[PDB]
Amino acid sequence: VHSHGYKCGTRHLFAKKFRKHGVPSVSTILTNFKVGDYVDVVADAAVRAGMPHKYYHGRTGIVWNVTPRGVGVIINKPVRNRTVRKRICVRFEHVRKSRCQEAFKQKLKDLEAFRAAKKAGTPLPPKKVSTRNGGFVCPKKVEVLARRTADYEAMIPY
Amino acid sequence: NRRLRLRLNPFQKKEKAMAKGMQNKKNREARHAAKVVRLAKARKNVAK
Amino acid sequence: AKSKNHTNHNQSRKNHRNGIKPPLPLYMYNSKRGGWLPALVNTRRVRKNNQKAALKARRERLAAHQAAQK
Amino acid sequence: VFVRLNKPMENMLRAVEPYIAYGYPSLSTVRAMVYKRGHLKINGQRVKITDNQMIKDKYHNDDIVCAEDIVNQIYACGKHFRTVTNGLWPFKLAPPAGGMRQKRRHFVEGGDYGNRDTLINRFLARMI
Amino acid sequence: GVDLTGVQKKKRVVRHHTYSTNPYIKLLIKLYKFLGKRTNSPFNKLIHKRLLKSRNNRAPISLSRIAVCMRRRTVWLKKGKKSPIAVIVGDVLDDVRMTRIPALRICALRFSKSARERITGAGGECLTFDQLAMMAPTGKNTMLLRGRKSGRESVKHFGAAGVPGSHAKPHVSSRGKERQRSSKRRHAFRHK
RNA sequence: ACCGAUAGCGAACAAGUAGCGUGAGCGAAAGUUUGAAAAGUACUUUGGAAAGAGAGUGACAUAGAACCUGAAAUCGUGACAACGACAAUGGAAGUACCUUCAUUUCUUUUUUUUACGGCCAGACCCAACCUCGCCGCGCAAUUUCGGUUCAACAUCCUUCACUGUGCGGGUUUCUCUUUUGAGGUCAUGGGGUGCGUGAGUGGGCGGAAUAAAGGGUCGGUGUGUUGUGUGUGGGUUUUUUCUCUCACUCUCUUCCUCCUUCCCUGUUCGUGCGUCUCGACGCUGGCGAUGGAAAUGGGGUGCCCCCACCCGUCUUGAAACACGGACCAAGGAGUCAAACAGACGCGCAAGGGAGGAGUAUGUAUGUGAGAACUCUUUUCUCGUACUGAAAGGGAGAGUGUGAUUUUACACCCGUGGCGUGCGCAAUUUCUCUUUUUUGUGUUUUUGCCCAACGCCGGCCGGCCCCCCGUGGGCUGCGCGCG
RNA sequence: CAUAAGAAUUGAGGCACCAAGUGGGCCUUCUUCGGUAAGCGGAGCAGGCGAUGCGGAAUGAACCGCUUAGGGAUAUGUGG
RNA sequence: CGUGAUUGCCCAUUAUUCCUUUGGUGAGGGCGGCUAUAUUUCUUUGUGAGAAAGUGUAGCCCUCCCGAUGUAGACGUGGC
């Protein structure tokens, strides 16, 4: 059985990788928040505080909190027969807003905007096509296949 | 069970009564078809 | 005869007996506890407020019995 | 069962091939299922079908009334496909004087499994 | 080839060839069972059903919590309907808090002596459900009182890894100082 | 509200005996004639003798002192018309034998077998699932060398093969052009019967349709036409001239060399025809078998076919070469019981439970009933706020209200989320009712829970430099409408 | 809640009380460690067996097929 | 020619189907003081013979439905 640091390491994961070294950007810091955001978790390294244990990068949870430097994310962690919500104390630097949800809503409103426009706003306005289908065809030059060995002396392994 | 069958299609009895068109009718088709294609056939011809 | 340790098999089968639960997650509302104290202080001041909404749950009651009681 | 087809749904079926046979029903056949194993599920109770009033009683609601709507709804869908189907009672066919053999797997890749497409009718018919 | 049952042959749960030893009930149920189903009345049915349970499952209700109900009348209508029907499948116990509260009509299993009286005496009315139903078929301006449940003590004795989340009182032997409670009310021994 | 002679004391018995052990001590086994009684079998007679056989007694000796009964294991016998490749008993199955049970029965009754609407399934017989298209075919043609003959030539063609001409007559469309359609095919069943009230056997006469026909009409399509136009991209085209048309694309052309809708002009097919139909229900009969004995149906043994490993148990796994298990009686193992958790019935309910006791008066043994009846003042006891080690405090911090809410007022829901419910409107019919159905409203978080104050004790005493007040601010088996 | 365009399900969900019986496993497709190896050892996944029989593999705990009311009638399974 | 001799099969507790059984958070109903509902069935293409014909029918009865192997272990009995 194995050794256990709460920050017990790995091979090639935590290490800060391919030209991706160094501090978080100021863009990172310019960000802005509100709570309830569904944001995803990543690990810089940078400061080895506010830094989750292993579970958590690549997972999406929801923020419940914004503290000075940091934000609270409750995440559902799967134990036995359940997922428990865990509320984790990160400083802001280790988390980011997805698109996961964004689209859904985005579309939903956009669509509504259109659906609404379409009735009950002014205009009227084509989008898409159906799915997939049949068709007339006037092709104009079919081929076939003849494979391997003819002129194999030109090619193949030795 | 014409009855439930008939519930489900009532044209069916009359279909059944009249075979949905028997034999004379069933042998008649081809022969038109056969010439007819030839008429169709015939058209493209020269215009190639 | 080497005396085996332990394992995990059967488990997802066991785990799936009784399933994989979350609980109506956001209960309808949170599970309580914690936060940033300057925010928490402020939120109480906008829940001060509750005695206002209790007199809005009484505003309607008065309207029904002052319009007419007939 | 009957299946509405669009890409996932093409996909769930896509995975499942050596466990299933599926393909393209025929109107004859459809009708015929509609005979043989014709049932509706009716607040439960699995009941072999009888009449277009019940059908309407369940499916007046998509202004279906009869099986010919149903079959129509099968071949020609409606997207009340779902709706129609779900109230079905599940079809149970027959042993079929035409085993599967080669110790299973797909048609070309075995026995039989996979999509018998139009050949499903051909197949299915001995099985109903 | 059968396949998963979501639990096979579906468990007592809410029950059938049924409960306690009081004769009357047995009638009641016969009476009422027709009524909810075959006098299509959710209320009746409800009644019917509601009749069926066990004592816990009929933990009482008491009066002042009805007061409120007769504040409801008061924010109901200007008042064409001007009447209201209380139900409790238990005994009505007296409360205390008010006890100068008005009269009114309550439809119960049992009213305490005192209560019964005093209620009635206050112009109230204690009607048994025979005294209800019959002369009350169908709801409408009925008020189900669904009892309580909660404030039993039993649940108290649910919980003890005394984490900051679990705050609950064990079935233990101190009835006084220590005798199994030495810290927690001090942070220190055997921590939290 | 005990045990029943292996029980029950050790000991129902001359038992704490007998017995046993040096001794200490250890310390058993062991029940019943008589409807009434010995009336306890005289007598005969054989028999050494026992004894026997008789007899004799007695209801009964299958009661003769082994006495009530007399279980099982085990064995003789009788009796057996019972059977045997050889495991053995075993399943299953049927027959034979059967001791067999129970049932029903004919000159108008049963019984085995035929037979029977509509049904109510299953199998046969013929039709077709279309179709654009090759394929080919034919011709000619080239190439193209083979059978004839002894071989060559005929017979460049036996033909495979090619290439061109020409054709549209002709197989593909396989248990894939349906997996189509009914016609009786009459063989199979593992039968078959009973709502009703009744518009009504309504319907069933067109309906169908290859199609011929006719185009026409518009409509769908490949093309030539581009009729373009659009697209411009390349060249020793900065640019302009010049050259390549390539890519697209418009109408167009209605080119079609092309579909189809419609509508006419055929054919078919059935129902029509006529309206009667009718398509929404067979213990019966025919076969042979008593007339009080049987017979149909049920029990038992044997026998044959097939089928098919010792139980229990421990184990990962036991048919093992794991253990225990020769047999039959009678024994022979999950108890009483506190606090306590749930469940449930059960009582009453903030009280409840007495409870210890004690009194208490006749039913009449008794009596002035642990147990009868109780019956109970005092209450006792637990319960009907909790919190603090404490010292100690302590809950409508009601609600509401004023409120600069020490206070002071008022006095029939703390704040939100949910709520069987109740309300309203639309919604169906119904006279109206009923009121189906719709559409909503609304309402205490004691209906449940959630979610947030609030509240008690608690703790830090906050805010602030420190401390106090507007007011804090951490915490707990607390409190929030008994 | 349409797209003009891209589910299916959902023989209920919610929710809970409380007590058992269990903790030696073993077998397998798959991955994989130790060691030559081992019907060996030792893990990972899924499935079994265990704790089920039926039907198949002349023979088999775990292979094939398939699981089971009691039957009846029919047809298949694996397998012939 | 165009198929057709004509019918390639044999055989599990699976499957269908069918019956009876059984349980079920199962479905129905009739559950009336003569309209009706079960029992028994004719005369037997459109009958409950309320009146052809005997018998039963007080909250249960009478129809319907899904499911139905299970060790340990548990629970149940209008079980013994």
PDB file of all heavy atoms in Angstrom, chain F residues 385-394:
ATOM      1  P     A F 385     -43.269  21.551  29.200  1.00  0.00           P
ATOM      2  OP1   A F 385     -43.662  22.254  30.421  1.00  0.00           O
ATOM      3  OP2   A F 385     -44.237  21.596  28.102  1.00  0.00           O
ATOM      4  O5'   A F 385     -41.886  22.126  28.760  1.00  0.00           O
ATOM      5  C5'   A F 385     -40.787  21.859  29.682  1.00  0.00           C
ATOM      6  C4'   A F 385     -39.417  22.459  29.291  1.00  0.00           C
ATOM      7  O4'   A F 385     -39.531  23.864  29.011  1.00  0.00           O
ATOM      8  C3'   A F 385     -38.289  22.370  30.369  1.00  0.00           C
ATOM      9  O3'   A F 385     -37.111  21.791  29.858  1.00  0.00           O
ATOM     10  C2'   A F 385     -38.068  23.837  30.738  1.00  0.00           C
ATOM     11  O2'   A F 385     -36.761  24.140  31.153  1.00  0.00           O
ATOM     12  C1'   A F 385     -38.363  24.466  29.450  1.00  0.00           C
ATOM     13  N9    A F 385     -38.521  25.854  29.583  1.00  0.00           N
ATOM     14  C8    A F 385     -39.677  26.538  29.655  1.00  0.00           C
ATOM     15  N7    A F 385     -39.520  27.812  29.768  1.00  0.00           N
ATOM     16  C5    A F 385     -38.168  27.953  29.741  1.00  0.00           C
ATOM     17  C6    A F 385     -37.362  29.061  29.554  1.00  0.00           C
ATOM     18  N6    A F 385     -37.826  30.269  29.539  1.00  0.00           N
ATOM     19  N1    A F 385     -36.067  28.886  29.334  1.00  0.00           N
ATOM     20  C2    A F 385     -35.613  27.640  29.364  1.00  0.00           C
ATOM     21  N3    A F 385     -36.274  26.505  29.584  1.00  0.00           N
ATOM     22  C4    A F 385     -37.556  26.745  29.660  1.00  0.00           C
ATOM     23  P     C F 386     -36.618  20.332  29.802  1.00  0.00           P
ATOM     24  OP1   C F 386     -37.360  19.473  28.865  1.00  0.00           O
ATOM     25  OP2   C F 386     -36.565  19.843  31.164  1.00  0.00           O
ATOM     26  O5'   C F 386     -35.165  20.626  29.261  1.00  0.00           O
ATOM     27  C5'   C F 386     -35.353  21.358  28.024  1.00  0.00           C
ATOM     28  C4'   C F 386     -34.570  22.611  28.048  1.00  0.00           C
ATOM     29  O4'   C F 386     -35.079  23.544  28.998  1.00  0.00           O
ATOM     30  C3'   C F 386     -33.192  22.575  28.462  1.00  0.00           C
ATOM     31  O3'   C F 386     -32.472  22.166  27.365  1.00  0.00           O
ATOM     32  C2'   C F 386     -32.794  23.864  28.871  1.00  0.00           C
ATOM     33  O2'   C F 386     -32.473  24.736  27.850  1.00  0.00           O
ATOM     34  C1'   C F 386     -33.982  24.300  29.428  1.00  0.00           C
ATOM     35  N1    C F 386     -33.788  24.321  30.772  1.00  0.00           N
ATOM     36  C2    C F 386     -32.991  25.344  31.257  1.00  0.00           C
ATOM     37  O2    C F 386     -32.400  26.079  30.476  1.00  0.00           O
ATOM     38  N3    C F 386     -32.810  25.489  32.558  1.00  0.00           N
ATOM     39  C4    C F 386     -33.264  24.556  33.367  1.00  0.00           C
ATOM     40  N4    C F 386     -33.101  24.738  34.667  1.00  0.00           N
ATOM     41  C5    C F 386     -33.899  23.381  32.855  1.00  0.00           C
ATOM     42  C6    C F 386     -34.099  23.283  31.541  1.00  0.00           C
ATOM     43  P     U F 387     -31.189  21.510  27.682  1.00  0.00           P
ATOM     44  OP1   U F 387     -30.592  21.037  26.434  1.00  0.00           O
ATOM     45  OP2   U F 387     -31.494  20.498  28.690  1.00  0.00           O
ATOM     46  O5'   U F 387     -30.312  22.658  28.294  1.00  0.00           O
ATOM     47  C5'   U F 387     -29.807  23.614  27.336  1.00  0.00           C
ATOM     48  C4'   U F 387     -29.189  24.818  28.002  1.00  0.00           C
ATOM     49  O4'   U F 387     -30.094  25.358  28.934  1.00  0.00           O
ATOM     50  C3'   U F 387     -27.899  24.709  28.744  1.00  0.00           C
ATOM     51  O3'   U F 387     -26.844  24.886  27.809  1.00  0.00           O
ATOM     52  C2'   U F 387     -27.936  25.735  29.798  1.00  0.00           C
ATOM     53  O2'   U F 387     -27.328  26.924  29.384  1.00  0.00           O
ATOM     54  C1'   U F 387     -29.387  25.902  29.972  1.00  0.00           C
ATOM     55  N1    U F 387     -29.755  25.279  31.132  1.00  0.00           N
ATOM     56  C2    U F 387     -29.428  26.003  32.253  1.00  0.00           C
ATOM     57  O2    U F 387     -28.843  27.074  32.255  1.00  0.00           O
ATOM     58  N3    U F 387     -29.750  25.433  33.412  1.00  0.00           N
ATOM     59  C4    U F 387     -29.948  24.119  33.585  1.00  0.00           C
ATOM     60  O4    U F 387     -29.877  23.686  34.726  1.00  0.00           O
ATOM     61  C5    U F 387     -30.198  23.374  32.386  1.00  0.00           C
ATOM     62  C6    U F 387     -30.071  23.974  31.212  1.00  0.00           C
ATOM     63  P     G F 388     -25.540  24.139  27.933  1.00  0.00           P
ATOM     64  OP1   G F 388     -25.001  23.944  26.574  1.00  0.00           O
ATOM     65  OP2   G F 388     -25.808  22.962  28.765  1.00  0.00           O
ATOM     66  O5'   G F 388     -24.579  25.091  28.733  1.00  0.00           O
ATOM     67  C5'   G F 388     -24.601  24.751  30.124  1.00  0.00           C
ATOM     68  C4'   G F 388     -23.991  25.828  30.923  1.00  0.00           C
ATOM     69  O4'   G F 388     -25.039  26.580  31.516  1.00  0.00           O
ATOM     70  C3'   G F 388     -23.153  25.274  32.061  1.00  0.00           C
ATOM     71  O3'   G F 388     -21.795  25.159  31.694  1.00  0.00           O
ATOM     72  C2'   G F 388     -23.333  26.281  33.132  1.00  0.00           C
ATOM     73  O2'   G F 388     -22.451  27.354  32.922  1.00  0.00           O
ATOM     74  C1'   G F 388     -24.744  26.652  32.876  1.00  0.00           C
ATOM     75  N9    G F 388     -25.619  25.823  33.582  1.00  0.00           N
ATOM     76  C8    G F 388     -26.417  24.850  33.109  1.00  0.00           C
ATOM     77  N7    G F 388     -27.111  24.308  34.023  1.00  0.00           N
ATOM     78  C5    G F 388     -26.772  24.997  35.117  1.00  0.00           C
ATOM     79  C6    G F 388     -26.974  24.658  36.417  1.00  0.00           C
ATOM     80  O6    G F 388     -27.770  23.816  36.788  1.00  0.00           O
ATOM     81  N1    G F 388     -26.190  25.358  37.264  1.00  0.00           N
ATOM     82  C2    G F 388     -25.362  26.341  36.853  1.00  0.00           C
ATOM     83  N2    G F 388     -24.771  26.922  37.784  1.00  0.00           N
ATOM     84  N3    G F 388     -25.303  26.816  35.653  1.00  0.00           N
ATOM     85  C4    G F 388     -25.906  25.986  34.838  1.00  0.00           C
ATOM     86  P     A F 389     -21.192  23.803  31.620  1.00  0.00           P
ATOM     87  OP1   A F 389     -19.845  23.992  31.063  1.00  0.00           O
ATOM     88  OP2   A F 389     -22.103  22.907  30.918  1.00  0.00           O
ATOM     89  O5'   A F 389     -21.070  23.502  33.112  1.00  0.00           O
ATOM     90  C5'   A F 389     -21.271  22.148  33.530  1.00  0.00           C
ATOM     91  C4'   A F 389     -20.585  21.911  34.843  1.00  0.00           C
ATOM     92  O4'   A F 389     -19.198  22.312  34.781  1.00  0.00           O
ATOM     93  C3'   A F 389     -21.100  22.758  35.957  1.00  0.00           C
ATOM     94  O3'   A F 389     -22.387  22.316  36.375  1.00  0.00           O
ATOM     95  C2'   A F 389     -19.948  22.582  36.924  1.00  0.00           C
ATOM     96  O2'   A F 389     -19.734  21.255  37.353  1.00  0.00           O
ATOM     97  C1'   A F 389     -18.881  22.961  35.989  1.00  0.00           C
ATOM     98  N9    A F 389     -18.793  24.423  35.844  1.00  0.00           N
ATOM     99  C8    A F 389     -19.323  25.323  34.954  1.00  0.00           C
ATOM    100  N7    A F 389     -18.937  26.548  35.167  1.00  0.00           N
ATOM    101  C5    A F 389     -18.180  26.448  36.282  1.00  0.00           C
ATOM    102  C6    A F 389     -17.533  27.391  37.049  1.00  0.00           C
ATOM    103  N6    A F 389     -17.476  28.664  36.741  1.00  0.00           N
ATOM    104  N1    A F 389     -16.829  26.973  38.090  1.00  0.00           N
ATOM    105  C2    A F 389     -16.721  25.673  38.297  1.00  0.00           C
ATOM    106  N3    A F 389     -17.285  24.679  37.623  1.00  0.00           N
ATOM    107  C4    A F 389     -18.055  25.151  36.674  1.00  0.00           C
ATOM    108  P     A F 390     -23.537  23.392  36.267  1.00  0.00           P
ATOM    109  OP1   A F 390     -24.783  22.764  36.715  1.00  0.00           O
ATOM    110  OP2   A F 390     -23.584  23.967  34.928  1.00  0.00           O
ATOM    111  O5'   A F 390     -23.108  24.434  37.353  1.00  0.00           O
ATOM    112  C5'   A F 390     -22.737  23.951  38.671  1.00  0.00           C
ATOM    113  C4'   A F 390     -21.733  24.801  39.470  1.00  0.00           C
ATOM    114  O4'   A F 390     -20.524  25.125  38.769  1.00  0.00           O
ATOM    115  C3'   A F 390     -22.318  26.113  39.868  1.00  0.00           C
ATOM    116  O3'   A F 390     -23.159  25.838  40.970  1.00  0.00           O
ATOM    117  C2'   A F 390     -21.076  26.970  40.048  1.00  0.00           C
ATOM    118  O2'   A F 390     -20.437  26.766  41.270  1.00  0.00           O
ATOM    119  C1'   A F 390     -20.263  26.472  38.926  1.00  0.00           C
ATOM    120  N9    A F 390     -20.650  27.099  37.755  1.00  0.00           N
ATOM    121  C8    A F 390     -21.358  26.533  36.748  1.00  0.00           C
ATOM    122  N7    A F 390     -21.585  27.300  35.787  1.00  0.00           N
ATOM    123  C5    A F 390     -20.913  28.396  36.152  1.00  0.00           C
ATOM    124  C6    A F 390     -20.426  29.411  35.387  1.00  0.00           C
ATOM    125  N6    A F 390     -20.663  29.449  34.082  1.00  0.00           N
ATOM    126  N1    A F 390     -19.747  30.378  35.999  1.00  0.00           N
ATOM    127  C2    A F 390     -19.618  30.296  37.302  1.00  0.00           C
ATOM    128  N3    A F 390     -19.866  29.277  38.107  1.00  0.00           N
ATOM    129  C4    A F 390     -20.434  28.324  37.410  1.00  0.00           C
ATOM    130  P     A F 391     -24.335  26.668  41.466  1.00  0.00           P
ATOM    131  OP1   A F 391     -25.046  25.889  42.483  1.00  0.00           O
ATOM    132  OP2   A F 391     -25.156  27.256  40.400  1.00  0.00           O
ATOM    133  O5'   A F 391     -23.634  27.733  42.165  1.00  0.00           O
ATOM    134  C5'   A F 391     -22.851  28.024  43.264  1.00  0.00           C
ATOM    135  C4'   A F 391     -22.335  29.379  42.958  1.00  0.00           C
ATOM    136  O4'   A F 391     -21.453  29.415  41.821  1.00  0.00           O
ATOM    137  C3'   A F 391     -23.554  30.177  42.536  1.00  0.00           C
ATOM    138  O3'   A F 391     -24.341  30.594  43.648  1.00  0.00           O
ATOM    139  C2'   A F 391     -22.810  31.276  41.856  1.00  0.00           C
ATOM    140  O2'   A F 391     -22.114  32.087  42.770  1.00  0.00           O
ATOM    141  C1'   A F 391     -21.795  30.537  41.072  1.00  0.00           C
ATOM    142  N9    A F 391     -22.282  30.226  39.789  1.00  0.00           N
ATOM    143  C8    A F 391     -23.081  29.223  39.461  1.00  0.00           C
ATOM    144  N7    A F 391     -23.302  29.109  38.223  1.00  0.00           N
ATOM    145  C5    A F 391     -22.745  30.195  37.713  1.00  0.00           C
ATOM    146  C6    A F 391     -22.863  30.716  36.457  1.00  0.00           C
ATOM    147  N6    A F 391     -23.468  30.001  35.493  1.00  0.00           N
ATOM    148  N1    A F 391     -22.316  31.929  36.250  1.00  0.00           N
ATOM    149  C2    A F 391     -21.652  32.500  37.265  1.00  0.00           C
ATOM    150  N3    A F 391     -21.473  32.076  38.520  1.00  0.00           N
ATOM    151  C4    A F 391     -22.107  30.918  38.670  1.00  0.00           C
ATOM    152  P     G F 392     -25.873  30.314  43.533  1.00  0.00           P
ATOM    153  OP1   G F 392     -26.636  31.417  44.161  1.00  0.00           O
ATOM    154  OP2   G F 392     -26.143  28.976  44.045  1.00  0.00           O
ATOM    155  O5'   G F 392     -26.161  30.276  42.052  1.00  0.00           O
ATOM    156  C5'   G F 392     -26.746  31.477  41.636  1.00  0.00           C
ATOM    157  C4'   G F 392     -26.501  31.752  40.236  1.00  0.00           C
ATOM    158  O4'   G F 392     -25.579  30.863  39.605  1.00  0.00           O
ATOM    159  C3'   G F 392     -27.772  31.592  39.540  1.00  0.00           C
ATOM    160  O3'   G F 392     -28.522  32.738  39.787  1.00  0.00           O
ATOM    161  C2'   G F 392     -27.269  31.550  38.171  1.00  0.00           C
ATOM    162  O2'   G F 392     -26.898  32.810  37.720  1.00  0.00           O
ATOM    163  C1'   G F 392     -26.074  30.706  38.332  1.00  0.00           C
ATOM    164  N9    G F 392     -26.539  29.458  38.123  1.00  0.00           N
ATOM    165  C8    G F 392     -27.054  28.580  38.980  1.00  0.00           C
ATOM    166  N7    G F 392     -27.721  27.635  38.373  1.00  0.00           N
ATOM    167  C5    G F 392     -27.673  27.977  37.055  1.00  0.00           C
ATOM    168  C6    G F 392     -28.318  27.429  35.954  1.00  0.00           C
ATOM    169  O6    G F 392     -29.028  26.450  35.890  1.00  0.00           O
ATOM    170  N1    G F 392     -28.083  28.105  34.818  1.00  0.00           N
ATOM    171  C2    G F 392     -27.396  29.234  34.732  1.00  0.00           C
ATOM    172  N2    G F 392     -27.476  29.801  33.550  1.00  0.00           N
ATOM    173  N3    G F 392     -26.787  29.793  35.765  1.00  0.00           N
ATOM    174  C4    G F 392     -26.912  29.074  36.880  1.00  0.00           C
ATOM    175  P     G F 393     -29.945  32.681  40.265  1.00  0.00           P
ATOM    176  OP1   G F 393     -30.330  33.832  41.085  1.00  0.00           O
ATOM    177  OP2   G F 393     -30.197  31.391  40.904  1.00  0.00           O
ATOM    178  O5'   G F 393     -30.659  32.807  38.849  1.00  0.00           O
ATOM    179  C5'   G F 393     -30.313  33.982  38.050  1.00  0.00           C
ATOM    180  C4'   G F 393     -30.228  33.811  36.522  1.00  0.00           C
ATOM    181  O4'   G F 393     -29.225  32.849  36.207  1.00  0.00           O
ATOM    182  C3'   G F 393     -31.409  33.386  35.664  1.00  0.00           C
ATOM    183  O3'   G F 393     -32.232  34.524  35.519  1.00  0.00           O
ATOM    184  C2'   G F 393     -30.724  32.893  34.434  1.00  0.00           C
ATOM    185  O2'   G F 393     -30.228  33.946  33.657  1.00  0.00           O
ATOM    186  C1'   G F 393     -29.680  32.129  35.121  1.00  0.00           C
ATOM    187  N9    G F 393     -30.188  30.908  35.616  1.00  0.00           N
ATOM    188  C8    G F 393     -30.267  30.443  36.886  1.00  0.00           C
ATOM    189  N7    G F 393     -30.702  29.237  36.963  1.00  0.00           N
ATOM    190  C5    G F 393     -30.890  28.918  35.669  1.00  0.00           C
ATOM    191  C6    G F 393     -31.376  27.769  35.125  1.00  0.00           C
ATOM    192  O6    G F 393     -31.703  26.791  35.769  1.00  0.00           O
ATOM    193  N1    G F 393     -31.514  27.850  33.778  1.00  0.00           N
ATOM    194  C2    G F 393     -31.104  28.898  33.027  1.00  0.00           C
ATOM    195  N2    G F 393     -31.220  28.740  31.742  1.00  0.00           N
ATOM    196  N3    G F 393     -30.581  29.983  33.532  1.00  0.00           N
ATOM    197  C4    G F 393     -30.535  29.926  34.842  1.00  0.00           C
ATOM    198  P     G F 394     -33.760  34.419  35.429  1.00  0.00           P
ATOM    199  OP1   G F 394     -34.332  35.778  35.541  1.00  0.00           O
ATOM    200  OP2   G F 394     -34.144  33.457  36.455  1.00  0.00           O
ATOM    201  O5'   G F 394     -34.115  33.810  34.098  1.00  0.00           O
ATOM    202  C5'   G F 394     -33.709  34.341  32.846  1.00  0.00           C
ATOM    203  C4'   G F 394     -33.898  33.312  31.779  1.00  0.00           C
ATOM    204  O4'   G F 394     -32.943  32.322  31.973  1.00  0.00           O
ATOM    205  C3'   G F 394     -35.209  32.619  31.906  1.00  0.00           C
ATOM    206  O3'   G F 394     -36.167  33.384  31.234  1.00  0.00           O
ATOM    207  C2'   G F 394     -34.931  31.302  31.334  1.00  0.00           C
ATOM    208  O2'   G F 394     -34.933  31.425  29.931  1.00  0.00           O
ATOM    209  C1'   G F 394     -33.583  31.084  31.941  1.00  0.00           C
ATOM    210  N9    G F 394     -33.656  30.549  33.295  1.00  0.00           N
ATOM    211  C8    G F 394     -33.251  31.187  34.377  1.00  0.00           C
ATOM    212  N7    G F 394     -33.341  30.571  35.474  1.00  0.00           N
ATOM    213  C5    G F 394     -33.860  29.419  35.073  1.00  0.00           C
ATOM    214  C6    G F 394     -34.103  28.310  35.805  1.00  0.00           C
ATOM    215  O6    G F 394     -33.804  28.272  36.982  1.00  0.00           O
ATOM    216  N1    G F 394     -34.738  27.322  35.093  1.00  0.00           N
ATOM    217  C2    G F 394     -35.026  27.417  33.771  1.00  0.00           C
ATOM    218  N2    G F 394     -35.776  26.456  33.276  1.00  0.00           N
ATOM    219  N3    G F 394     -34.633  28.432  33.035  1.00  0.00           N
ATOM    220  C4    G F 394     -34.102  29.398  33.749  1.00  0.00           C
TER     221        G F 394
END
